[PDB]
UniProtKB/TrEMBL annotation, chain B:
Disulfide bonds join C4-C29, C47-C100, C59-C190, C148-C155. Residues 2-192 form the BetaCoV S1-CTD domain. This is Spike protein S1. The chain holds residues 320 to 513 of 1255 of the full protein.
Length: 226, 192, 216
């Protein structure tokens, strides 16, 4: 099988250099164009450029050559994307993609894609979250159903994961996408709805894991008497 | 049983320089030439010794396909009886050629805004090529024929570059060319 | 430059529906038009190239048509795995000018469902740290469009809240939404009544959930 495998997620500060990579296997690496695609947060897809490995032929898209260098080392079947001075605006998902080929007088799109490399560029530094309960009360009940949750505040970088009762509670859970605050730190909540009757019989614990800071927190969410 | 692989030739990702032109033998297959002649796409589709629209009615011993790139103004040299740097020193068809020459503009795949200089041609040589001869040597050339070592007086590298930019007129733009040679002398390549 | 514009930007459809998405190029791109599918978090997948050629492994319910400036992706019968975002991309130009359309998100149509609304005062643990986050939850509603406004002592707020919305639930096709009001502890303590007011197509009247600071 054709496979493109990209290097792992990156977190950098502005002004730093960065080189990410994509290694092809399962096909003749020097026989296909391969290139890079940017997807900024919440946005669509943009070509950055392509390269034909084992020839000297790099073709950049738009104005990307002024900020990035695309290169390849055919001897290890690897393509690269590199920055000399990152900006926060480089925060994006980056994909490598193999170009299927050409026909007649034009090109085909990308037939095989890497899994993506997340790049975060920020002046923020690693920080684990504070975890606060969203305790069920008479203001978070609706017709015999109670909502409860945990507020996972002030962490950097993404991601955090949240489970409930160590994974035993999955039905009714919504863990929201994180928002970036003006401080540069992320925040999210995770909520679940349960029968209000269960508040007196079932313990509810949110399990928060922020692997980038080695922070793991259990927070019991205790029913309020109000 | 199987269809001749004309797609692998005409739609190949990489084409060679004309001095290093490449040949594919096509054999033991069913050729449907209407994939070529019933399309409006080629800028040049000239046949010699045969009518394009009658190709599906003939059987040949073998078909050969030769692939390369030249600039638009040089496509006219890919014909029987021509002279010029391309016909004389790079790719030569015989006067009695039986086959077709197909060419198409490839500006957006072979040229770039910043210029593609990777395609080459030979511009100096002691003697013209024989028909279908290929010369891929890169020997320093001297008019007196004696060996020489660049850099030196009366010593020249014999290959030069095409410069393919998207912004030139079509005569300077790149064209891919396929030359189909139809061999008569048991047939292995037949129409449907 | 070649601009690629897709229509619609968003489509709500049911399993079994015939779905048509169009792509217009600002100049002729001949046949060099590709369609991709992308699901959240996952890489794009090539469906169609050369305007109408199906990529190997893609189901034949996907088909492409068109030439020149106008192109169509058709899904003859939408299936559960087809809810996704679709992109077109022209590959007529040199790579310097290759361009994608903006995407068309195909979501699941279902009946209107009003949100259940819940409010959470800041925890005493958080208040000890000097900040107050008030969370309003809108749970399991459809369609996605919703308005949440905060009121503090009956004064409509602006600027001090952030919202987050889930992707559509694959099992009940609803959305959920959080709105978080963030104040310093000192500001929180200057006011009594905290309320979030929710308006949604499924609600005949806006729903307000409120509390008085200190009522527990
Ligand atoms: C070079 O490639 C083009 C594009 O083909 C597509 O891309 C290739 C890389 C392969 O993956 C193909 O399998 C894939 O479809 C080839 O395109 C096409 O030629 C065919 C045959 O002539 C055209 O189909 C026909 O159209 C006529 C009239 O419209 C009908 O009567 C026929 O019944 C048949 O449907 C097809 O439209 C055309 N496609 C495009 C986009 O132009 C091309 O043939 C190939 N070159 C060679 C020499 O094989």
């Amino acid at each position: 099988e054709v496979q493109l495998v990209q290097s792992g997620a990156e977190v950098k500060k502005p002004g730093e250099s960065l080189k990410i990579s994509c290694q092809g296997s399962g096909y003749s690496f020097t026989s296909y164009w391969i290139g890079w695609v940017r997807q900024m947060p919440g946005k669509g897809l943009e070509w950055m450029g392509i390269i034909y490995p084992g020839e000297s032929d790099t073709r950049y898209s738009s104005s990307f050559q002024g900020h990035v260098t695309i290169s390849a080392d055919k001897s290890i079947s690897t393509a690269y994307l590199q920055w000399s001075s990152l900006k926060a605006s480089d925060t994006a998902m980056y994909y490598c993609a193999r170009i299927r080929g050409v026909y007649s007088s034009g090109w085909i799109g990308g037939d095989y894609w890497g899994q993506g490399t997340l790049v975060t560029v920020s002046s923020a530094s690693t920080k684990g979250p504070s975890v606060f309960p969203l305790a069920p009360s008479s203001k978070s009940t609706s017709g015999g159903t109670a909502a409860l949750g945990c507020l996972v505040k002030d962490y950097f970088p993404e991601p955090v994961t949240v489970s409930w009762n160590s994974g035993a509670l999955t039905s009714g859970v919504h863990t929201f996408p994180a928002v970036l605050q003006s401080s540069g730190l992320y925040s999210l909540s995770s909520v679940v709805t349960v029968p209000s009757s269960s508040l007196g019989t079932q313990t509810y614990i949110c399990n928060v894991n922020h692997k980038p800071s080695n922070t793991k927190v259990d927070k019991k969410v205790e029913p309020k008497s109000c | 049983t199987n269809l001749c692989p004309f797609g692998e030739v005409f739609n190949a990702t990489k084409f060679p320089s004309v001095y290093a032109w490449e040949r594919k033998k096509i054999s033991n297959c069913v050729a449907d030439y209407s994939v070529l002649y019933n399309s409006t796409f080629f800028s040049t589709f000239k046949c010699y010794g045969v009518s394009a629209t009658k190709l599906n009615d003939l059987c040949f011993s073998n078909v050969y396909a030769d692939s390369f790139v030249v600039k638009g103004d040089d496509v006219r040299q890919i014909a029987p009886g021509q002279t010029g740097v391309i016909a004389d020193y790079n790719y030569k068809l015989p006067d009695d050629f039986m086959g077709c020459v197909l060419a198409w503009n490839t500006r957006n795949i072979d040229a770039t805004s910043t210029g593609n200089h990777n395609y080459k041609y030979r511009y100096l040589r002691h003697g013209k090529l024989r028909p279908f001869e290929r010369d891929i040597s890169n020997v320093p050339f001297s008019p007196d024929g004696k060996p020489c070592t660049p850099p030196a007086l009366n010593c020249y590298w014999p290959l030069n570059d095409y410069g393919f930019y998207t912004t030139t007129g079509i005569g300077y733009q790149p064209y891919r060319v396929v030359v189909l040679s139809f061999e008569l002398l048991p047939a292995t390549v037949c129409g449907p | 430059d070649i601009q690629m514009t897709q229509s619609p930007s968003s489509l709500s459809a049911s399993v079994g529906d015939r779905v048509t998405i169009t792509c217009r190029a600002s100049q002729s791109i001949s046949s060099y038009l590709n369609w991709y599918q992308q699901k959240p978090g996952k890489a794009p997948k090539l469906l169609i190239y050369a305007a109408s050629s199906l990529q190997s492994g893609v189901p034949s319910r996907f088909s492409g048509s068109g030439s020149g400036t106008d192109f169509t992706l058709t899904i003859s019968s939408l299936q559960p795995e087809d809810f996704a975002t679709y992109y077109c991309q022209q590959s007529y130009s040199t790579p310097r000018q290759w361009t994608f359309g903006q995407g068309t998100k195909v979501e699941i149509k279902r009946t209107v469902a009003a949100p259940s609304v819940f409010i959470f005062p800041p925890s005493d643990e958080q208040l000890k740290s000097g900040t107050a986050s008030v969370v309003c939850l809108l749970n399991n509603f459809y369609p996605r469009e919703a308005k949440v406004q905060w009121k503090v002592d009956n004064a409509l707020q602006s600027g001090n809240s952030q919202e987050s919305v889930t992707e559509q639930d694959s099992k009940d096709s609803t959305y959920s939404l959080s709105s978080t009001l963030t104040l310093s502890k000192a500001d929180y303590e200057k006011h009594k009544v905290y309320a979030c007011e929710v308006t949604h197509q499924g609600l005949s009247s806006p729903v307000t959930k409120s509390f008085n600071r200190g009522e527990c």
